[PDB]
Design a protein around this ligand. Structure first.
Ligand SMILES: [Cu+2]
Ligand SMILES: [Cu+2]
Length: 440
């Protein structure tokens, strides 16, 4: 009812259980005024949103109907790596049931996508992604209960011959960006707000595109990062979301009107093909062209809600027991990507840590591109980048590093088992930039 807005179908837990059979299948669909066959979960692009509460049981059977093997990564979920198994392979025509319990303190926006090494980037680019939302008791406070809530899945695409465009040699180096810059699988949808306060859950599920988000005439009020709430709302004029990151923001519409949500120009250090003359400068690709993501129409006579004064206190973490250094490097022309000078080997354990301890990880980008570093299974707290303090306290699982930046991360080691860390420009992961962590 009311005005329509494209948004994935939601599947909710019931009586403490979300049991769902999800097929990964090629699917002809309508897209930006044409028809294309994508790879999809549940026949939709994006895939369906799974919405759960803490302590729920999730029983997701993944039915592989693809021509190639696949698996799922439960991105951001602090569960067992024996469930969130980055080494599992589900052959074509086979199924696998993922069963886990949602942790008691968890809240926010998470997502699921393929993690079969070597094939992540084509599979994710072809459409295999969906969101997972964990509801919180905090969502009941009046300042959030009465906000108009929406999920915005930021994911671009390019098509050739009615199918996802093939990966080029340049895509393996830079990561693939598409010419169709979509929101919830739609080209520049219009959202006609019925409330003056919106709560937008934001997911960057793109292979490589960055989104320097800005809303015309409006600040954003950040209330959640990748893996949970901030301690209190943080007003920002704009918000950069790297591949794999999520955020939740409140928007306070003060005036009537139509306002563009844009992805402003951002230069992530992608490299262009080489050229003659024009002098001026060199041959980086330079900043992205600005893109309109959606149109937001304010309701009549808008009166926004007050902001909540407080959200969730961040747990104090114990003193760390060990410091690690992880150096990211690249060989751009070979399109190979390294951590501490090595490419991923699934039979090599790179770091051995202890369950129930906290470590400090120093992640150093010695490349020229932005690399967004992701660690499975163990959410972390970012302390500093470039020697300066991170602007808020919240659980993160992806941290963006620009050329030369060093992040210092507090990593509490939770579940035992073997898991991975990798750049979330997924082409770089496929081309080497991944290593193996074992917790005992
Ligand atoms: Cu991910
Ligand atoms: Cu990278």
């Amino acid at each position: 009812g009311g005005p329509s807005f494209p948004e994935p179908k939601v599947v909710r837990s019931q009586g403490g259980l979300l049991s769902l059979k999800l097929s990964a299948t090629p699917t002809p669909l309508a897209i930006a005024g044409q028809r294309a066959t994508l790879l999809t979960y549940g026949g939709s692009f994006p895939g369906p949103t799974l919405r759960v509460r803490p302590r729920d049981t999730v029983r997701l059977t993944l039915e592989n109907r693809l021509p190639e093997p696949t698996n799922l990564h439960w991105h951001g979920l602090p569960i067992s790596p024996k469930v969130d198994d980055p080494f599992l392979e589900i052959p074509p025509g086979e199924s696998w049931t993922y069963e886990f319990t949602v942790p008691k303190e968890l809240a926010g926006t998470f997502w699921y996508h393929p993690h079969l090494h070597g094939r992540v980037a084509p599979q994710l680019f072809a459409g295999l992604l969906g969101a997972l939302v964990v509801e919180s008791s905090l969502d009941a406070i009046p300042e959030l209960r009465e906000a108009e809530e929406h999920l915005l899945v930021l994911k671009d695409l390019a098509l050739q011959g009615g199918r996802p465009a093939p990966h080029t040699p340049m895509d393996w180096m830079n990561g693939k960006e598409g010419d169709l810059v979509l929101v919830n699988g739609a080209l520049r949808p219009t959202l006609v707000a019925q409330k003056a306060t919106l709560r937008l859950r934001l997911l960057n599920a793109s292979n490589a595109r960055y989104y320097r988000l800005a809303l015309q005439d409006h600040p954003l009020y950040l209330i959640a990062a990748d893996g949970g709430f901030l301690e209190e709302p943080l007003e920002v004029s704009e918000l950069l979301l790297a591949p794999g990151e999520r955020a939740e923001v409140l928007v306070r519409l003060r005036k009537e009107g139509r306002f563009l949500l844009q992805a402003l120009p951002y230069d992530r250090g992608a490299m262009g093909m080489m050229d003659m003359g024009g002098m001026a400068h060199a041959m980086p690709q330079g900043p992205s062209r600005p893109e309109t993501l959606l149109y937001l129409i304010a309701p009549k006579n808008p009166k926004p809600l007050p902001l909540p004064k407080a959200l969730s206190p961040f747990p104090t973490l114990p003193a760390p027991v060990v410091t690690r250094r992880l150096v990211l490097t690249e060989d751009m022309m070979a399109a190979r990507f390294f951590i501490n000078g090595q490419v991923f080997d699934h039979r090599r354990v790179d770091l051995k840590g202890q369950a129930q301890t906290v470590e400090v990880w120093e992640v150093e980008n010695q490349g020229d591109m932005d690399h967004p570093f992701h660690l499975h299974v163990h959410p972390f707290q970012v302390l500093s980048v470039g020697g300066r303090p991170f602007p808020y306290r919240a659980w993160k699982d992806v941290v963006n590093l620009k050329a030369g930046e060093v992040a210092r991360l507090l990593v509490p080691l939770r579940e035992k088992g073997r898991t991975v860390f990798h750049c979330h420009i997924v082409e770089h992961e496929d081309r080497g930039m991944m290593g193996v962590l074992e917790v005992g």
